[PDB]
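P.,

For your records, the input lines for the assembly:
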Amino acid sequence: NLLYDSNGNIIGFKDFLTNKTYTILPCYSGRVSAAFYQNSSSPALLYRNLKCSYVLNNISFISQPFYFDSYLGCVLNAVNLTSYSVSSCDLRMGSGFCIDYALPSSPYRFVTFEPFNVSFVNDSVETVGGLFEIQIP
Amino acid sequence: TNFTIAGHEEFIQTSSPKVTIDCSAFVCSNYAACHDLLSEYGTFCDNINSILNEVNDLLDITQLQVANALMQGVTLSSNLNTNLHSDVDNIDFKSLLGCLGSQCGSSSRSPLEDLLFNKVKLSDVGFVEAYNNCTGGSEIRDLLCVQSFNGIKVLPPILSETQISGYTTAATVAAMFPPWSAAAGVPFPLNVQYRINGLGVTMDVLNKNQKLIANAFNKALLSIQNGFTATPSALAKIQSVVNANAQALNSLLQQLFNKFGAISSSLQEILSRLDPPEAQVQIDRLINGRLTALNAYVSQQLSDITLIKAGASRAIEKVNECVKSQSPRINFCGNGNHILSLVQNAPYGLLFIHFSYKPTSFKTVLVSPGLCLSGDRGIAPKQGYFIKQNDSWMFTGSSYYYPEPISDKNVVFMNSCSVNFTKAPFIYLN
Amino acid sequence: ANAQALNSLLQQLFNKFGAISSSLQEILSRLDPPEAQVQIDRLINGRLTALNAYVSQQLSDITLIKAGASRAIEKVNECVKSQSPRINFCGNGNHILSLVQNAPYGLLFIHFSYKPTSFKTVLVSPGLCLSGDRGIAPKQGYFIKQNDSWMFTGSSYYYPEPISDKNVVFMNSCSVNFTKAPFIYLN
Ligand SMILES: *[C@@H]1O[C@H](CO)[C@@H](O)[C@H](O)[C@H]1NC(C)=O
Ligand SMILES: *[C@@H]1O[C@H](CO)[C@@H](O)[C@H](O)[C@H]1NC(C)=O
Ligand SMILES: *[C@@H]1O[C@H](CO)[C@@H](O)[C@H](O)[C@H]1NC(C)=O
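C-alpha cells returned:
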C-alpha cells in the first residue's frame, strides 16, 4: 500500500477506505533576487522562472501594483523598457538584461545590456564600376 | 606536384554553468529547530555564498573579456544585408553568417550553430526551460526541480548566446567585405593567395587555379558540416562537461541522505521521535557533515574555475592571433601549413575552423643547397631549391614543383662561395 | 579583497561552534577541565577547518597571481624591451611601443598607438593586369587612378606616389578580375 523511492522517500500510496492511488510531490521552494540602488527606498524584485499570476496567487501576499512577465521571471517594482539599450550597468540580471535606476511611476528601468557595438561606414559593398570604395586616412 | 585544402575543427571550453547554492536552505530548509543551531555558526554559509559570488564574478569578467576580444576594432558597412552576402569569389558562407542589420530581430543563429546547439540539451536556455517547467506538472521526478527545491540552482550568464553569435557573425563578415577589417585591408582571395605563397608555392599555379581553391573550400565546409552530424572529438567535449557538471550536482545532492553517525538521515523522524535536547547532537552532526561537503564542493569549484580561466585565456589568445590577424608563428594556429582560421559560437566555448595546405602527389627530384658561380661568389636559394633541367640549373618552390629561371628575387648574394657548393661557372645572373 | 579576507579570518574567532561561549576565559573560569575538554575540542576543530579553508583560498589566489605574473613577464619581454611582429598582442593593432613603470603589487604599462583623425573616400583596385600577360599586386597599399594615371598609396595614409619595384610584386600572369592597363610602362 506504499510506494517508495530508491532513497527511501514516499512518492505514492493507496488509501484503505476508498482504494484510490495518489502521488506525493514536494511543494515549491525558491529564493528572490533584490536589486537595490545606493540611495533607494525599495529594491526591485525578481522571481526567476515564475509567472506573475502564480506569485500573486500563491507567494506574494503584499499589494504590488507594478508587475510584468519577462524572460527571466516576474519583475516587481519596475517598468518594461526593453526597447532602450545601455552600454554599461551595475545590476546585471542575466541573458543580456539589466535594471537601470532613474533619479526622480517606479524609478527602476528594465532595459537591455549591449556593452559592445560595431562601427558603420557609408561606403558601398559591391564593386563601383570594378573598383572598391575604401576610406584612407 | 598537386595539392588540395583540408578543414579541421577545434573546441575550447570558455564558459561554465554559474551554480549558486542556498546554504541555509540546503542545511535547514524548513525546520526552525535546525536554523536555531545553524545560526550558531552562520559564517560557514556566509563564506560559501561569498566564494560562489566570487566565482560568478570571475565567470562574468571572463565572458566580458571574451566578448571584447571578439568585438575589438571591427568596422562594417551600413548597406550590408544577409541577402547581399554569403558569397565572395565563388565561396559560399551561408552556413557561417546570420543577420545583424536591416534583417532578423530576435534570436536567430547560423545553421552551423543551430546544428551545434541542437545536439546539447542543457544549454543556456535549457536550464531556464527546465526551471520554469517545474511549476505546472510537466515533469514528475525531474532532478533539476528537486535540486532547486533544496537550494541548488544554476543562473544564466550576463550575456546570452545570441549576442555572442552576433559578435561572431560580425567578426566573420569583417573578413569578407570591404574594408576588410579582419584582414588588414586585404581582399579574401588575395589574402588566401598570399598565405599559400608564404609556404613556398609559386604565384603562377595560384593564379591559374582560382576556381580550384574555391571548390576545395566549399568541399571542406561541406565535409565539416556533414561530419558534425555524428559525434566527433569536438562535440564530445561539451557533452563531457555537461555530464561532469551533472555528476557533481548529483553527488552534492546525495549528501542529504547520509546519517553521519545519527539515528536517521531525515529531520522529520528525528523531530517526531526525540526531544530537542536529545536531537541537538544529531542536528549538529548533520550540519557538520553538510558543511564539510559544501567546503569540498567549493574547493573543487575553485580548482575548476582556475582551469577554466586558463583555458579561456588560451582561447582569447588564439582568437586574437589566428582569426583577426595572420600571425607569423608556425605550429601555433594549425599544423605547419596553416592558411586561414575561422571562429564560430559553441555551447560553453567557441568553435574554430582551421584550413590547411595538404598535398596529394609528390615527386622525387634531386636538389642542391647552393652553387658556386664564376668569380668566387656564393648563391643560396630563398625558401627553395636549385634543380638541374636539361643541363641547366633552375629554381623551384619548396612546397610545389615548378621550374622557373633564377633571378634576384629568389637567391642571396655572397662574396665567397662554400666548398660544399656545386661548381657551375656556365650559369650567370639571368 | 585582502582586507576582507583578513577581517573574515579574524571574525571567525568569535564563533561558539556549538559551545557555551566563544571565549576560553569564561569556559576555564566557569567549568572544570573534564567538562571544558569537549568545548575546547570543538573550538579547535572549527578554527582548524577555517584555517584549512583560508589556506586553500590562498593557494587558489596565488595560482591565479602566478598566471597573471607570467603573462606580465611575457608582455614585458615581447612588448617593452623588443618589438614583436605579433598583431593585437601589445595593443589594438596600431601599437607602436610600450613602456613599463613600477606599480603597487604589479606593473604599469604605457602603450602608444596610431590614431587617425580625418578620412576621405577613394576608389581602389586589388590589382592590375599589365601588357603581355603580366600582373602586379600592391604591398601594404592600394592602386589609385589620379589624372588618368594609375598610382600607389599607403593603407594608413593617403599619399599618392608613382609605382616602383619596391612597392608592388611581379607575376608571370594576371587574374581575370584585374583591371587591364597596358599604358603602365614602369618596369
Ligand atoms: C477495497 O479493496 C478491498 C480488497 O478487495 C475490499 O475488501 C474493500 O471493500 C474495498 N473498499 C472499497 C471502498 O471498495
Ligand atoms: C558602443 O560601445 C562603447 C563602449 O562600450 C560605448 O561607449 C558607446 O556608447 C556604444 N555605442 C552606442 C551607440 O551605444
Ligand atoms: C663538405 O663538408 C664535409 C664536412 O663538413 C666534408 O667532409 C666534405 O669533404 C665537404 N665537401 C666538399 C666538396 O668540400
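Two observations worth noting. The pocket of 2-acetamido-2-deoxy-beta-D-glucopyranose (ligand 2) is lined by residues A 87, 115-117 (CB under 6 Å). Residues 52-59 of chain A form the longest helix (8 residues).

Regards
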